[PDB]
Amino acid sequence: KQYIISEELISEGKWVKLEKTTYMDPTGKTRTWESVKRTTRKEQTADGVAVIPVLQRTLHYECIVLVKQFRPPMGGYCIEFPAGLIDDGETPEAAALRELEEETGYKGDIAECSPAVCMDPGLSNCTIHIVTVTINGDDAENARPKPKPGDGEFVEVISLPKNDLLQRLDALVAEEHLTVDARVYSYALALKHA
Amino acid sequence: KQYIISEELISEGKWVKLEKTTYMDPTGKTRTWESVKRTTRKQTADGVAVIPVLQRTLHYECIVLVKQFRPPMGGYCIEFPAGLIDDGETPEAAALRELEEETGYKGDIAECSPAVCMDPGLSNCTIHIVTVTINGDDAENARPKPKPGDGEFVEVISLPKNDLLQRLDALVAEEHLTVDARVYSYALALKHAN
Ligand SMILES: Cc1cc(C(=O)Nc2ccn(C)n2)on1
Ligand SMILES: [Cl-]
Ligand SMILES: [Mg+2]
Ligand SMILES: [Mg+2]
Ligand SMILES: [Mg+2]
Ligand SMILES: [Mg+2]
């Protein structure tokens, strides 16, 4: 029934643009919407990846590896899955493994890769693949992992046991000014609910 | 250590604005970021998203989701029921309200998250995730009445909780829909639990 009629550029930065979207509603009426897009998306199947990194070690409970960094749009520190945009010609899986190593120091093994999923679809066209990766924390490569932050990247690693993730996140929110990502929270909630 | 120095308005629409944020990086170097914000924030958060657990005796427990055309996406998306919080509305009340408007179901609040971020490298947008149970055996949830506001057009899709990820994957492959990242994250964790 519904579909896009036109997309008009309102304003274009280096990284983000705003568009006036005209679309057909299901009654047959023409309507508009204000849409955010990135300018960096080329032939990739999504803008980025987010990594669900399950750190596995003998005689340890599994941990979910998270990152904390200052996010200028939020004006503060956020706890998130490791994540980055996909380079031109790069696969989602390669992007995931690369960002996970850059942000955390860990070398993961691919487990699964989602289809492109939408970040905030009432506002933007932005999409990611969520890539689940296991980390063999008994491997010597993963013994004392050091982040390789890029230019302007400043990332702290937080590994939380999977079996208590929601409470551990809540404890972090209680003891500090910082925001948990909605995908991380959704993941922690389902772990409780299961 | 890092903080915001100033925010420059680039473009302001009715619903969304684009800003250039100046911030201090941890090395002491001043840097810029392009940031999106909504023009509607008042509240605890921009919006709510509802995790609606449909409980009917002798049936599988279902998660109730919604399918809508999303103009920024140019396509249809599957999401948790959700909307913006009305000025002077509590998150819990916004959750029950949106759930009724979008699905027709009348639910009970189980728990409510702190404000969590939507896409923190792009925007300041935040929501509360509100877990709600729905007694599907009550008369008020027999023939649920969806009350769409002006221009909203929503289809309701209930999927079994214990199979959610496989059911979503199927909807993507066969219906060319985009699943929301929070929904996908929830589904993954249901599989990853234990
Ligand atoms: C973001 C975002 C949300 C909307 C939206 O519903 N816009 C409407 C509805 C009625 N008018 C006059 N504009 O557009 N962009
Ligand atoms: Cl529940
Ligand atoms: Mg990153
Ligand atoms: Mg990165
Ligand atoms: Mg809605
Ligand atoms: Mg509504």
Curated annotation (Swiss-Prot), chain A:
The modification Phosphothreonine is found at residue 32. Signal peptide: none annotated. Residues 44-184 form the Nudix hydrolase domain. PROSITE patterns: NUDIX, NUDIX_BOX. It holds the Pfam family NUDIX. Changing residue 153 to Q: Reduces catalytic rate 120-fold. Enzyme that can either act as an ADP-sugar pyrophosphatase in absence of diphosphate or catalyze the synthesis of ATP in presence of diphosphate. In absence of diphosphate, hydrolyzes with similar activities various modified nucleoside diphosphates such as ADP-ribose, ADP-mannose, ADP-glucose, 8-oxo-GDP and 8-oxo-dGDP. Can also hydrolyze other nucleotide sugars with low activity. In presence of diphosphate, mediates the synthesis of ATP in the nucleus by catalyzing the conversion of ADP-ribose to ATP and ribose 5-phosphate. Nuclear ATP synthesis takes place when dephosphorylated at Thr-32. This is ADP-sugar pyrophosphatase.
